[PDB]
Design a protein around this ligand. Structure first.
Ligand SMILES: [Cl-]
Ligand SMILES: [Cu+2]
Ligand SMILES: [Hg+2]
Ligand SMILES: [Zn+2]
Length: 258
């Protein structure tokens, strides 16, 4: 039975099909702010999304993915802990059934209402499938969401969700500008980890921003109206699609800021 987030197929079961779930550099993790070390050898981070080309939005039965044209260097992440250039391929979120949970990373055990992952692949490996065979194939920019004022740059996503309610549905999603999902500050923590959904591949340099974005209660409420199930199946609301914190093991979390 497919992986998911319910009691019978959720994160505590993933290891049986994906034994790497219990591996040496799994994500997410708790970010203990008092033991992360400021690292002065970190170059500033460069987020260049002005030429981004969004194509489509898809409900895949686990979350929704906003997919980008990554066939040219258009929306790239560089600098910070990264060597070379990473190309944006998609973003998605993880969120809760209530505002007190939903993030995957936690900050001194604090859970945010949701978390945005902008997924990029290392353009020295030619494309995504080859990048995910490399320990430095991916960079994911992770951004916490808290409930407060609306985030204007998220509204076009929220408005399209009605049209991709159930698993397998997709809609045209061109000209979406991901710059409108960023907070003001680019201060971040970074550590080596993995994708947080099966197949949980240990390819990711995580860059998790310290500053959350605020979204309104009405915006997150619309995320919670999505469905894990497909059309004409019984309703299973898409909520709590987050994996909990995993063992830090032999890893150090570095901070970009004092
Ligand atoms: Cl690898
Ligand atoms: Cu699936
Ligand atoms: Hg890998
Ligand atoms: Zn994710």
């Amino acid at each position: 039975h497919h992986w998911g987030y319910g009691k019978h197929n959720g994160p505590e079961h993933w290891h049986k099909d994906f034994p790497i779930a219990k591996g040496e550099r799994q994500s997410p993790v708790d970010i203990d702010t008092h033991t992360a070390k400021y690292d002065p050898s970190l170059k500033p981070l460069s987020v260049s999304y002005d030429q981004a080309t969004s194509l489509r939005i898809l409900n895949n039965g686990h979350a929704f993915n906003v997919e980008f044209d990554d066939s040219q260097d258009k929306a790239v992440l560089k600098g910070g802990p990264l060597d070379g250039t990473y190309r944006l391929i998609q973003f998605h979120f993880h969120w809760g059934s209530l505002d007190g949970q939903g993030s995957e990373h936690t900050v001194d055990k604090k859970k945010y209402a949701a978390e945005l992952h902008l997924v990029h692949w290392n353009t020295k490996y030619g494309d995504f499938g080859k990048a995910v065979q490399q320990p430095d194939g991916l960079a994911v920019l992770g951004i916490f969401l808290k409930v407060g004022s609306a985030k204007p740059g998220l509204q076009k996503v929220v408005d399209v969700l009605d049209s991709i309610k159930t698993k397998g549905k997709s809609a045209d999603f061109t000209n979406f500008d991901p710059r409108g999902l960023l907070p003001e500050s680019l201060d971040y923590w970074t550590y080596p980890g993995s994708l947080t959904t099966p197949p949980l591949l240990e390819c990711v340099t995580w860059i998790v921003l310290k500053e959350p974005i605020s979204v309104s209660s009405e915006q997150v409420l619309k995320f919670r109206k999505l469905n894990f199930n497909g059309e004409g199946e019984p309703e299973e609301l898409m909520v709590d699609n987050w994996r909990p914190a995993q063992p830090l093991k032999n890893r150090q979390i570095k901070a970009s800021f004092k």
